C-alpha cells in the first residue's frame, strides 16, 4: 500500500539471477540490473542483493527471487525501498559461518574452493538469510555467515577473506530458526490483536508521532484474556515480530 511497493512477482529464476525490474522501477528508483539494492524483507530480512532488471524481456511488474524471498520470508510486493548499500562495508576477517549442512554433501575442502569462487565475483546475491544458489564440490555450499551487521555480504575488497568459523553449523538449528513464529500465525483477531500490535508498533515505529499528538503516548497495553486457546502462540509471534527484549 505504498508507492515504494511495486508489484513484486516471482522472478524468472527462484534466485536473484533473472529478476525483472520494471522500466518504471528502473526509472523512479535507481534500479539497475547489476546494482546493490537495499530492499525490504519481512522478519528482519536485510536484502542487499543485485536484482536484475529484465524489463527488456518483459517490462512487467517487479519480479522477485522466489527461493531467496521464501528463505528470507520476504513479501513479494512489499515496499522494497531498494537503495544502494555501499555504506555497509565488510571487514577483512569476519566470522564467516561455515554451515555443516552446507558441507553435508560437499566433497573435500570445497569450502576453500567455493570461497575462492565467492571471494572475487561471487556471482550470487550479496545478502544474508535468503536462498542464494551456491554451488561448490558438486553440492549446495551455503556456508555463509547468518548475517553481518555491517555488510552481511562481501562489501570489502574481493581478497578480504573473512575468517571462516571453525565449527560447522548443523542443519537442525537452521531448520529451527527458519520455522519461526511469524505474524502470519497471528490471524483471526485481525481487529483486537491488530489494534494492540499497531499500538505497540507505532509506539516503537513512530513514538515521535505519539509525542507530537499533544497527548502523552499510552504507557503500555495489557493483553487480551484468551480462553485457553493458547496465548503463547500470539505472544511468541509478536516477540518474533518485535525487536524488543
Amino acid at each position: 500500500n505504498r508507492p515504494n511497493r511495486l508489484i513484486v512477482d516471482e522472478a524468472i529464476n527462484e534466485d536473484n539471477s533473472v529478476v525483472s525490474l520494471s522500466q518504471p522501477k528502473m526509472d523512479e528508483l535507481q534500479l539497475f540490473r547489476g546494482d546493490t539494492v537495499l530492499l525490504k524483507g519481512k522478519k528482519r530480512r536485510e536484502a542487499v542483493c543485485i536484482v536484475l532488471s529484465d524489463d527488456t524481456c518483459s517490462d512487467e511488474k517487479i519480479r522477485m527471487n522466489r527461493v531467496v524471498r521464501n528463505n528470507l520470508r520476504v513479501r513479494l510486493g512489499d515496499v522494497i525501498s531498494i537503495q544502494p548499500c555501499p555504506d555497509v562495508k565488510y571487514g577483512k576477517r569476519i566470522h564467516v559461518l561455515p554451515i555443516d549442512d552446507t558441507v553435508e554433501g560437499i566433497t573435500g575442502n570445497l569450502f576453500e574452493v567455493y570461497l575462492k569462487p565467492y571471494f572475487l565475483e561471487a556471482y550470487r546475491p550479496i545478502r544474508k538469510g535468503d536462498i542464494f544458489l551456491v554451488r561448490g564440490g558438486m553440492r549446495a555450499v551455503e556456508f555463509k555467515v547468518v548475517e553481518t551487521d555491517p555488510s552481511p555480504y562481501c562489501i570489502v575488497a574481493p581478497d578480504t577473506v573473512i575468517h571462516c568459523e571453525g565449527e560447522p553449523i548443523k542443519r537442525e538449528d537452521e531448520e529451527e530458526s527458519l520455522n519461526e513464529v511469524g505474524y502470519d500465525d497471528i490471524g483471526g483477531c485481525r481487529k483486537q490483536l491488530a489494534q494492540i500490535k499497531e499500538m505497540v508498533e507505532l509506539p516503537l515505529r513512530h513514538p515521535a508521532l505519539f509525542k507530537a499528538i499533544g497527548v502523552k503516548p499510552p504507557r503500555g497495553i495489557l493483553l487480551y484474556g484468551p480462553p485457553g486457546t493458547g496465548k503463547t502462540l500470539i505472544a511468541r509471534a509478536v516477540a518474533n515480530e518485535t525487536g524488543a527484549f
Binding site: 526509472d27 546493490t36 562489501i155
Partner: protein, 86 residues
C-alpha cells in the same frame, strides 16, 4: 570529467562505481565512445589514468578492453558499473 554530454543525443546516467565503491554517475551521450568515458574517468581521476583502467562489471566480469565501443552499445544506463585500475 571530459565526457561527451549532449541533451539532443541519448544521455545515460552511467553510475561508474569506483574500486572503492564510489559510483561516479555521469550522464554521457550515446554517441560518446568508450574512449570518451575512459578520458572522462582519467580527467576526473588520475588514479585510473596511471593504471590499466578497464571497466569490468562485478556481475559478470567483463573488462572494457574495446575502448572504441560507443556509449549506446555499452548499456550502462542507470547502472552501478564497477571500475578498477590495473
Amino acid at each position: 570529467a571530459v565526457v561527451l554530454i549532449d541533451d539532443s543525443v541519448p544521455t545515460t546516467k552511467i553510475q561508474i562505481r569506483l574500486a572503492d565503491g564510489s559510483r561516479l554517475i555521469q550522464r554521457f551521450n550515446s554517441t560518446h565512445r568508450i574512449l570518451d568515458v575512459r578520458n572522462f574517468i582519467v580527467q576526473s581521476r588520475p588514479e585510473f589514468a596511471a593504471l590499466d583502467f578497464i571497466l569490468v562489471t562485478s556481475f559478470p566480469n567483463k573488462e572494457l578492453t574495446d575502448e572504441s565501443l560507443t556509449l549506446l552499445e555499452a548499456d550502462i544506463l542507470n547502472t552501478v558499473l564497477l571500475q578498477q585500475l590495473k
